[PDB]
Amino acid sequence: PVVKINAIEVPAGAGPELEKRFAHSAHAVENSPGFLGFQLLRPVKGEERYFVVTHWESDEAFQAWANGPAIAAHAGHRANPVATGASLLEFEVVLDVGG
Amino acid sequence: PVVKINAIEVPAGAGPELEKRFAHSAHAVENSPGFLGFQLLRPVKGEERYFVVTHWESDEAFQAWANGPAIAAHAGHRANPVATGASLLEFEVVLDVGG
Ligand code: MNH
Ligand code: MNH
Ligand code: MNH
Ligand code: MNH
Ligand SMILES: [Cl-]
Ligand SMILES: [Cl-]
Structure with missing residues (x-):
């Protein structure tokens, strides 16, 4: 499997506005083939x-x-956008271990 | 939930030895109270x-x-060690969306 992290730069104080924009975005990706999930961090x-x-x-x-x-x-x-820049970070999952 | 990413600098070609070290490391963290899993990327x-x-x-x-x-x-x-340095990146999970 792969992981793609988008690392987004956010102005001081804009965190709340940015998270609100993600808050109801599940529908846009939830039903994609091969999609295994995502987190906003x-x-x-x-x-x-x-x-x-x-x-x-x-x-x-x-x-x-x-x-x-x-x-x-x-x-x-x-x-x-509220974001001031972005960088896509792409990885291959080498080991995946559950709780 | 929280996410702690350790970002480890690893010289080219040591990836195999490093991945081999991680392949035998699950025992060290799994079943820890409150641990929800982990991936090497x-x-x-x-x-x-x-x-x-x-x-x-x-x-x-x-x-x-x-x-x-x-x-x-x-x-x-x-x-x-085969790693060169490390930086701990610490996050709060604001949004979690599954497949
Ligand atoms: C140039 C590039 C570019 C810009 C300026 C950009 C900007 C935006 C802005 C602004 C919003 C916020 C909308 C709102 O009011 O809710 C938004 C949302 C979003 N965008 Mn994008 N976006 C991309 C690229 C861009 N997007 C890329 C690339 C992806 C992923 C492959 C992506 C994915 C999304 C998704 C998914 C949403 C959320 C949609 C929703 O809630 O309906 N996009
Ligand atoms: C991983 C892959 C990935 C790529 C390359 C991607 C790329 C972009 C780019 C480029 C931007 C514009 C940033 C800027 O600096 O102006 C942007 C914006 C955005 N994206 Mn995303 N995006 C996702 C995934 C991605 N996005 C997913 C998953 C969602 C959630 C359904 C999402 C939702 C958003 C939202 C919401 C915006 C608007 C952000 C803002 O207003 O700053 N996305
Ligand atoms: C600071 C310095 C520091 C050094 C030099 C270091 C070095 C090593 C070396 C070398 C190995 C495995 C080699 C082998 O024999 O196969 C190893 C393994 C490991 N280390 Mn550390 N380590 C840390 C910090 C360090 N560790 C920190 C901090 C954590 C977590 C909070 C951590 C967690 C581990 C775990 C887990 C293992 C794997 C143990 C095992 O599989 O037996 N650590
Ligand atoms: C999240 C938190 C986390 C922290 C702060 C952490 C920190 C460290 C530090 C610091 C080093 C030494 C790097 C160097 O530059 O010499 C190191 C090494 C190491 N760590 Mn980890 N580490 C984990 C999680 C962590 N580790 C987990 C989980 C595992 C696996 C069960 C693990 C396994 C290792 C192994 C294996 C090494 C030895 C790497 C090597 O061979 O160089 N770990
Ligand atoms: Cl994004
Ligand atoms: Cl590590």
């Missing part, structure tokens, strides 16, 4: 970015979502 | 560090693991 220490952590069965499944549904899920919204 | 693009992504009920559950078990699990291990 609020930084607390050691990092200043929000980490949007997504898990996929394969890189192909991620690309498919990113190129179609993801762009479609923008239809009603403004494209005016 | 090999970097692919946008990062050169391995991300050790750990999930916990609470920060206190994480600290109790780090202050006892994690230190104890070093007893007897005569290997020299």
Whole structure:
């Protein structure tokens, strides 16, 4: 499996506004093939970015979502971001261990 | 829940030895009170560090693991480290969405 973390830069005080924008976004990705879940992660220490952590069965499944549904899920919204920059961090899951 | 990512710098070519070390490490953390699982992530693009992504009920559950078990699990291990440095990135889970 793969992990794609989008590391997003957020201005001082904009955390609440950013999280509200994610709060009702589940529908946009929940039913994608090969999608294994995602978390919005609020930084607390050691990092200043929000980490949007997504898990996929394969890189192909991620690309498919990113190129179609993801762009479609923008239809009603403004494209005016609170985020000041972004970096996609991409990994291969080498070991996965549960509780 | 909380997420603690340890971001470890690892010289090119030591990835196999490092991954081999992690392949035999589950015993050291699993069944810890409040531990919810963890992944080793090999970097692919946008990062050169391995991300050790750990999930916990609470920060206190994480600290109790780090202050006892994690230190104890070093007893007897005569290997020299292959990692070059580490930075702890600490997060709060604001949103969790499954498949
Ligand atoms: C240039 C690039 C770019 C810009 C300016 C951008 C901006 C935005 C803004 C602003 C919003 C907030 C809308 C709102 O008011 O709720 C939003 C939401 C969102 N966007 Mn994007 N977005 C991308 C790229 C961009 N998006 C990429 C790339 C992805 C993923 C592959 C993505 C995924 C989303 C999803 C998913 C939402 C949430 C949709 C929803 O709630 O319906 N997009
Ligand atoms: C991992 C893959 C991933 C990529 C490359 C991606 C990329 C982007 C880019 C680029 C931006 C614009 C940032 C800026 O600095 O202007 C953006 C915005 C956004 N994205 Mn996302 N995005 C996701 C995943 C991704 N997003 C997922 C999963 C969701 C949740 C359903 C989501 C939801 C959003 C929302 C909401 C915005 C608007 C953020 C803002 O207003 O700052 N997304
Ligand atoms: C600071 C310095 C520091 C050094 C030099 C270090 C070095 C090592 C080396 C070398 C190994 C395994 C080698 C072998 O014999 O196969 C190892 C394993 C391990 N270490 Mn550490 N380690 C930490 C800190 C350190 N560790 C911290 C901090 C944590 C967590 C809070 C941690 C957790 C572990 C765990 C868990 C293992 C795996 C134990 C096992 O599989 O037996 N640690
Ligand atoms: C999250 C929290 C977390 C912290 C702060 C942590 C910290 C460290 C530090 C510091 C080092 C030494 C790096 C160096 O530069 O020499 C190290 C090494 C190590 N750690 Mn970990 N570590 C884990 C979690 C953590 N580790 C977990 C979970 C495991 C596996 C059960 C693990 C396993 C290792 C192994 C294996 C090593 C030895 C790496 C090597 O071979 O160089 N760990
Ligand atoms: Cl994002
Ligand atoms: Cl580590």
